[PDB]
């Protein structure tokens, strides 16, 4: 049991565009949100 | 590499990565996955002239090293022979052998 | 073939988590997101229950779209 419960959070960490990245609805929830956010941000940076 | 999480073994077997029969049988006609092992290894490296001038014991020399990705594979986990051949040729040409 | 095809489509929809609205004939297995890893599960379940013959090649390799899988299932 922790003594602190604070922190700054990403409230849209579970949002992803599976169809764009050739994923499947059953595969997507199994991918760490870190990987999904990395994909999204990398694509945005490359396009920018 | 020390294995202590059963979940990792379960997830590797769920992905059909591990053989359910025995050890890794490479070049065998009945290869059906690999076996999980443990090992810790540490090496000491140094540029050759600095080792020679230091009277250090030398037992091998690294001539070259390279890395790439098999991003053209049919699947993410599946290998790609073309990328491996390009990597080998690149290292060989760079090393001068 | 009709009953086998319906059961196979149900199996594919379960494993893919799709609708069967967009898992149509034109659908391409690559866009769906079926890897060889998932095609192995599809074929294993298929052989275990339906008793159909899909060994050593999965589906995504030989069957690019649902057309090819349905054709294979028809046994033409």
Swiss-Prot record, chain B:
Gene that encodes the chain: CTB1
UniProt protein name: Non-reducing polyketide synthase CTB1
Changes seen on gene knockout: Abolishes the production of cercosporin. Does not display any pigmentation. Leads to fewer necrotic lesions on inoculated tobacco leaves compared with the wild type.
UniProt source species: Cercospora nicotianae (Barn spot disease fungus)
Function per UniProt: Polyketide synthase; part of the gene cluster that mediates the biosynthesis of cercosporin, a light-activated, non-host-selective toxin. The perylenequinone chromophore of cercosporin absorbs light energy to attain an electronically-activated triplet state and produces active oxygen species such as the hydroxyl radical, superoxide, hydrogen peroxide or singlet oxygen upon reaction with oxygen molecules. These reactive oxygen species cause damage to various cellular components including lipids, proteins and nucleic acids.
Induction: Expression is positively regulated by the cercosporin cluster-specific transcription factor CTB8. Expression is also affected by nitrogen and carbon sources and pH, and is also controlled by another transcription activator, CRG1, previously shown to regulate cercosporin production and resistance.
Top-level division of the source organism's lineage: Eukaryota
Domain free text: Multidomain protein; including a starter unit:ACP transacylase (SAT) that selects the starter unit; a ketosynthase (KS) that catalyzes repeated decarboxylative condensation to elongate the polyketide backbone; a malonyl-CoA:ACP transacylase (MAT) that selects and transfers the extender unit malonyl-CoA; a product template (PT) domain that controls the immediate cyclization regioselectivity of the reactive polyketide backbone; 2 acyl-carrier protein (ACP) domains that serve as the tether of the growing and completed polyketide via its phosphopantetheinyl arm; and a C-terminal thioesterase (TE) domain that facilitates the release of the final product from the enzyme.
Transmembrane annotation, as ranges: none
